Amino acid sequence: ISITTEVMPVSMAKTSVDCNMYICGDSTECANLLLQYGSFCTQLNRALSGIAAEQDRNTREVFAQVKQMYKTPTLKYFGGFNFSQILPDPLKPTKRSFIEDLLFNKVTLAICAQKFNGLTVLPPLLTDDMIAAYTAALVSGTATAGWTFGAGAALQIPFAMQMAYRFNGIGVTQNVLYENQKQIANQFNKAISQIQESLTTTSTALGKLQDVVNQNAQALNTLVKQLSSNFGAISSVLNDILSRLDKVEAEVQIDRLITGRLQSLQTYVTQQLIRAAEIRASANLAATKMSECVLGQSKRVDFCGKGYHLMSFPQAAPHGVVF
Amino acid sequence: QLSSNFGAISSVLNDILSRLDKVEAEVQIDRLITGRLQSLQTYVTQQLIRAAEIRASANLAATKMSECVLGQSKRVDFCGKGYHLMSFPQAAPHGVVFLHVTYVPSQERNFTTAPAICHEGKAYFPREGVFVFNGTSWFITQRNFFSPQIITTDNTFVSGNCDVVIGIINNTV
Amino acid sequence: DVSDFTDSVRDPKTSEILDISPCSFGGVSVITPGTNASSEVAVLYQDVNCTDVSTAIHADQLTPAWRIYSTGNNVFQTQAGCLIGAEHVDTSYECDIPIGAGICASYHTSIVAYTMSLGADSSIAYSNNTIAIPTNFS
Amino acid sequence: TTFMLKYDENGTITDAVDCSQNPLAELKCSVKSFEIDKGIYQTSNFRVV
Ligand SMILES: *[C@@H]1O[C@H](CO)[C@@H](O)[C@H](O)[C@H]1NC(C)=O
Ligand SMILES: *[C@@H]1O[C@H](CO)[C@@H](O)[C@H](O)[C@H]1NC(C)=O
Ligand SMILES: *[C@@H]1O[C@H](CO)[C@@H](O)[C@H](O)[C@H]1NC(C)=O
Ligand SMILES: *[C@@H]1O[C@H](CO)[C@@H](O)[C@H](O)[C@H]1NC(C)=O
Ligand SMILES: *[C@@H]1O[C@H](CO)[C@@H](O)[C@H](O)[C@H]1NC(C)=O
Ligand SMILES: *[C@@H]1O[C@H](CO)[C@@H](O)[C@H](O)[C@H]1NC(C)=O
């Protein structure tokens, strides 16, 4: 018996920009010159809000698939299989599981305070507690509550007859499980332990979730860095060229900075649209794996596992899921 | 964006050419040409991104019509929400609509089961079902519908001896 | 700071050092029941402190200054900004309109803000010798 | 102030909306309508002068 891990991003950070505070600071004349360009601030705001709403749709599609929140059994020992370290621990303060705690520590980032940029980051609709609650109902409904799940309702199988029913689905007979239950149960427990050890004392196994964070940070750093450069004007800073430049020779130096800053903003929004489409194609795949591998037994080759698929368990992660 | 000036005297041509005739008009027209060229390029790029998102949906619809409509899918929740049975396509404006027909068990009942049976020092396992105690006898039935069938040598098969199993129940066959 | 802005300054009056924050800006979004069932609306000031933006409305220091507007002591903190015009409740529902981190607003019976209801609380009787088998279909 | 004037097919102004009286009035002048579906819509920004 083997257990392998698979990491998939499903979401990314939600950003928004203040089109007038970024292009211009606290200057009235800069705002007036901006209105000549028509509806460019409104287009950018709508484009970024469209992406932001989509991130919440991605998460709801993957995780909110069970209409009922089954309670954790409080036994966590079914037949011979040790299901702890997957389900939450009642006496622990956190609502997560042991393995989920390992995942949340590993993926590290790159009360209210603002920045002079005009940029900000909105919070996701589903908190980490809600996401962690969902994956507990899926695991607890898989061990107990029978395979009949999704297409129907829970049907209360003893979990010694699942593996017999799932061994029967790969081409072996039922007597293979029953006569070797102790060996099969032991190999299951050892496989989970090695997953624990590898997660605790590794360096880089969640690079897909790491790449999402690093790419987002690089994009925002570039946008800020463009504020500190003129585009053929006397200087980048306003009120230092806007004072000793009469009142008509400064109207053409400002139009140079404004045109340059719009392009830096437009370039940023266009690349967020291409990046979001990549996350959407990844969140769609993770939703199909949650339905065909967790809620069923998959016969497609190399889709869920590597050998012959028996079953699967979902665990939450920062802006992603782990199977 | 056509009714929008871009720093020029006027946002409409024939009103810069009427009040100017030479390089003075060229300097204003260049401001308009630059502004109108950007808004046109921005429109085209956003259409390219949208066109790709709708090609991915048209590819999924082509996979559904091949798998759900021309056959019977074994994939979970791919076609409907229960046990897929059939499917029909219906045209819609700039789209398609599918009518999935699925099977949904409803009632449910409680029974007592077992993994095997011991008759003559040998273990009998089921082939394509489970053992249900019912309350008066011992039967073998299919997992999706309730239909007790009397046990027989054609329902079960002999595997191993009557030692290594957790919970055999002695019964006739 | 790391963004090469002005994070601090030293007073030239022979005194100590201070800090500098960017005053308080953000966005506003208006929640509406649909104009077919009511005319009252709630307002969300995104990413602010309710105390800071409640006194600002008192001294008339907001650039979007609405002539006929007031705050009827319904200020709510949430985490996605300051909410004004909707009263907090402790009865979870199905999130008609989403707001911030696990907060939603609905009309029901004035606008009311609550916490999301994930699903129905259910339990399964797990035993080691019992099976359930359907007897009817649809 | 900014107004949102409605023109009739006969060519005469019929109704209007004052885009600075209410938060709702600002919403109307932003989506260019007189009736709006339920939801949350983002409008202009705010500063503390
Ligand atoms: C199950 O695994 C946990 C994790 O180490 C362990 O503490 C517990 O003792 C195990 N259960 C049994 C019955 O050995
Ligand atoms: C708001 O400010 C008060 C004191 O000024 C502070 O105690 C509180 O934590 C702040 N709330 C925030 C920043 O969300
Ligand atoms: C089967 O027994 C369980 C445990 O008491 C109970 O919850 C369930 O309702 C029973 N099923 C039926 C159909 O009565
Ligand atoms: C189910 O639990 C009872 C209670 O100890 C036990 O006697 C019985 O052998 C168990 N059945 C199986 C299949 O383990
Ligand atoms: C199944 O349900 C239908 C409708 O509820 C009913 O007419 C039919 O008699 C039921 N069948 C059985 C075997 O109870
Ligand atoms: C427009 O004018 C026609 C006749 O001039 C009149 O019948 C109608 O009521 C007016 N208003 C409309 C059509 O809304």
Contacts of the segment A174-182: beta carbons below 8 A, 24+ positions apart? A174/B115, A174/B125, A174/B126, A175/B123, A175/B125, A175/B159, A175/B160, A178/B115, A178/B116, A178/B125, A178/B164, A178/B165, A178/B166, A179/B160, A179/B164, A179/B165, A181/A79, A181/A80, A181/B166, A182/A80
Instruction: Check B125 against A158: CB less than 8 A apart.
Output: no
Closest residue by Cα to atom 5, ligand 6, is D10
Q: What one-character-per-residue DSSP string does A71-102 give?
A: PP-S--EETTEE-TTTSPPTTSSSSS-HHHHH
Per-residue b/e over C73-105, b at no fewer than 16 CB within 10 Å?
Answer: eebbebebbbbbbbeeeeeeeebbbbbbbbbbb
Q: List residues bridging with C120 in a β-sheet.
A: A68
Q: Which of C88, C86, C79, C25 is nearest to C52 (CA)?
A: C25
C49 lines ligand 2 (CB under 6 A): yes
Chain D positions touching C52 (Cβ under 8 A) are 48
Contact partners, residue A311, CB within 8 Å, separation at least 6: A142, A162, A166, A294, A297
Q: Which residues of A touch D2 (CB under 8 A)?
A: none
Strand B149-150 relative to strand B139-141, pairing: antiparallel
| Contact of A314 with A87, CB cutoff 8 Å | no
Q: Which residues are within 8 A (CB) of A157 and not within 5 positions of it... i.e. 6 or more apart?
A: A145, A146, A147, A148, A165, C131
Q: CA C76 to CA A107: how far, in whole Å?
A: 33
d(CA B161, CA B164): 7
- Specify the DSSP element, H or E, that contains B112: strand B110-112
Specify whether the CB–CB gap between A313 and A306 falls below 8 A: no
Interface check C124 vs D, CB under 8 A: no
Q: How deeply is A297 buried, as exposed, middle or buried, from its count of CB atoms within 10 A (0-12, 13-18, 19+)?
A: buried
Cα C102 to Cα A124: distance, rounded to the nearest angstrom: 9
CA distance A169 to A176: 13
Check pocket membership of B110 for ligand 3, CB cut-off 6 A.
Answer: yes
The answer to whether A138 and A97 are in contact (CB under 8 A) is no
Residue with tokens 């590597």: A306
C128 Cβ inside 6 Å of ligand 4 = yes
Q: What does each C-alpha distance from C100 to A11, A50, B105, C54, C76 come to in angstroms? A: 16, 16, 39, 20, 12
CB B149 within 8 A of CB B155: yes
Crossing angle for the helix pair A251-289 and A207-225, to the nearest 10 degrees:
170
The three-state secondary structure class of C52 is helix
Amino acid identity, position A187: Q
- Cβ contacts of residue B34 below 8 Å, gap of 6+? B6
Q: CA neighbours within 13 Å on the CB side: how many for B13?
A: 9
Q: Which of A23, A15, A25 is nearest to C47 (CA)?
A: A15
A vs C: CB pairs below 8 A: 101
CA distance B139 to chain C (A): 13
Distances, alpha carbon A303 to alpha carbons A288, A292, A307, in Å:
10, 9, 10
Regarding the beta carbon of D42 and ligand 6, being less than 6 Å apart is answered no
Q: Does C22 touch chain A (CB under 8 A)?
A: yes
- What is the sign of the dihedral through the CA atoms of D33, A55, A276 and A286? negative
Instruction: List the single residue in A with minimal CA-CA distance to B81.
Output: A151
Resolution of the structure, angstroms? 3.3
CA distance B56 to B61: 9
How far does B80 lie from chain A, in Å, by closest CA?
A: 9
Tokens of A83: 């299901």
Pairing mode of beta strands A320-322, A315-317: antiparallel
A9: left (phi over 0), alpha (psi -120 to 50) or beta: beta
Coil vs helix vs strand at C71: coil
Atom of ligand 6 nearest to the CA of D10: 1
Q: How far apart are CA A144 and CA A137, in angstroms?
A: 10
Structure tokens at A143: 């061990």
End-to-end CA distance of chain A: 16
